[PDB]
Design a protein. Sequence first.
Lengths: 303, 303
Amino acid sequence: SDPLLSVLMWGVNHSINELSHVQIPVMLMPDDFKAYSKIKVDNHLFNKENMPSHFKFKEYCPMVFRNLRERFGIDDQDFQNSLTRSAPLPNDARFHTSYDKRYIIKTITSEDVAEMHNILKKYHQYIVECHGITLLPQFLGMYRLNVDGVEIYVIVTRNVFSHRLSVYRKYDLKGSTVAREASDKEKAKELPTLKDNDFINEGQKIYIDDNNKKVFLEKLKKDVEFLAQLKLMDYSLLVGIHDVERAGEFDPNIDVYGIKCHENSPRKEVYFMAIIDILTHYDAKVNPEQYSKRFLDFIGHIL
Amino acid sequence: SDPLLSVLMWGVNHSINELSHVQIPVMLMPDDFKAYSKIKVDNHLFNKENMPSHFKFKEYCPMVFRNLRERFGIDDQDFQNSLTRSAPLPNDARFHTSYDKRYIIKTITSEDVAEMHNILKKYHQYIVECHGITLLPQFLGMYRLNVDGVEIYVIVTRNVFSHRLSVYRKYDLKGSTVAREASDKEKAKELPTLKDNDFINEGQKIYIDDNNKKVFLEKLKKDVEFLAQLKLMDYSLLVGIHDVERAGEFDPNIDVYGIKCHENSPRKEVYFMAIIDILTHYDAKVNPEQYSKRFLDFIGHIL
Ligand SMILES: CC[C@@H]1C(=O)N(C)c2cnc(Nc3ccc(C(=O)N[C@H]4CC[C@@H](N5CCN(CC6CC6)CC5)CC4)cc3OC)nc2N1C(C)C
Ligand SMILES: CC[C@@H]1C(=O)N(C)c2cnc(Nc3ccc(C(=O)N[C@H]4CC[C@@H](N5CCN(CC6CC6)CC5)CC4)cc3OC)nc2N1C(C)C
């Protein structure tokens, strides 16, 4: 097994257990956005079967993230179970998904962590204002893991895709001026990741009613403008299509990004659409304000 | 509340939780007697209501002590509950007792801890040999607590007295040549601690049948000789009398040191008798081999 994974599981278990003893108030204080809990474990000639002997686990702003979970309709006991009852599964930036497919666990940089801290309060207030109804990533936990030498940072989000319904096609859309296209090595996977021109070449249509579309684009408008005002760019719309005829009703309380196709759709389809990859990443590298309108226009045209 | 007490409770809770994930083998390995687990917690602007912000908890030889609990008929979940569901109560060396009166928690020195480590394996093997039937202290856990500056060591033992039945009179007997007597300041308490000459002056009798006496003294003989061979001295026989007429059947599976009075006893009495205070303590200060026979003779005469 992966020792970083077992520290993550141990840590989330420890985190949620600790919070079960902490009183939940309705409001956050400015200090909650600067808070953390740190635990350092040293086992000498003990418990080698389960845990590395020397590890650290640090949770950033535990009260804020608990408040976010609640606002996103997520119970702490359930969150704990999803992350701990069985190991998260790998995919290959690399990521894991909880065994029940409800949550995504992504390894991030210390720079991403700094950026998340920078936006956390404004992010929180935005979620308050929209009552948790948003196409933004739903940030549920943020941690630092140390296992004798190696140090990693992780963030946990709600899965954009369904926890039951399988996805047969997936798009990552930015709407950029610079040409975007998938590679053939990716094509060879069971579920590849297609891009802008794949969509605007294979004549992909999304069959949703005018009401669903209006609601979606209203939501997208606000989300994107919030991202713009934080000077964030290079995020994508993730789009996943579930084909009912191959594998089809979903729970909107769990698969919160799902939209049914309208009645005249050529095939029985369910769409899963959300914004992803919102943090900067100074390892990769035209302005944020331009990026947003450009992103908003493209999604307008394709839908 | 007492922050050292809440670290103890947190630590025992954490300890038992961790062990619930560790496989129980039938046997201990030599390394289990050198093992420990260390956890250091640092909370910044978080969880001030329950815990100090900076503390450490260290458990010595967790596998050995788990094995001892099992051998003493104690379930880990029950032990955990007894120590954590409500705070232990103070008494004033000073000690606490678990809320349900099942366990004693005593603060000890780093010297006592060194001595316990020194005897732990031999102690364990002795308990194996007698199948847990002994008048020795039943050692159940040993810990180190740190709360920002202060460092303390604690050991947990089974209560010599009953967890239901009240005790109206208590003796601490060593059988020493040097005169031993209680003080008047102690007398003024609801339940004082009387000594050798109080017994051998107030004409105290213990009314148990010849079978119970023989069994007791056989047990005492072996226990004391084991203590002698470890070069330990200055331990006492603790004696507590429960008066049924004032407050009377006990569970021998819980109140393991209880002995009913015989049928011709002037009053309905239950006795609780065990050895206590077996470690050296180099702060207090004629040889161990002499001490034992001298202790064994006195208990022979008074019973
Ligand atoms: C965290 C950052 C960001 C973000 O901000 N949010 C909010 C977010 C939210 N949700 C997701 N979900 C997924 C994104 C992408 C995929 C995918 O294409 N995965 C492929 C690779 C592995 C492939 N494997 C799976 C097991 N298969 C074995 C089968 C036989 C049993 C064999 C084939 C399946 C297809 C799947 C997702 O769900 C599992 N991603 C997010 N991102 C992503 C950029 C990582
Ligand atoms: C750990 C070291 C060693 C050892 O090795 N083993 C194995 C061991 C095992 N068991 C005990 N038990 C007790 C020893 C002694 C006493 C006592 O005289 N206590 C007095 C002081 C407090 C008094 N308070 C109680 C609350 N009261 C309030 C009432 C109104 C509600 C008011 C009066 C009650 C009488 C009580 C014990 O049980 C609670 N002691 C041990 N020792 C002792 C030397 C500490």
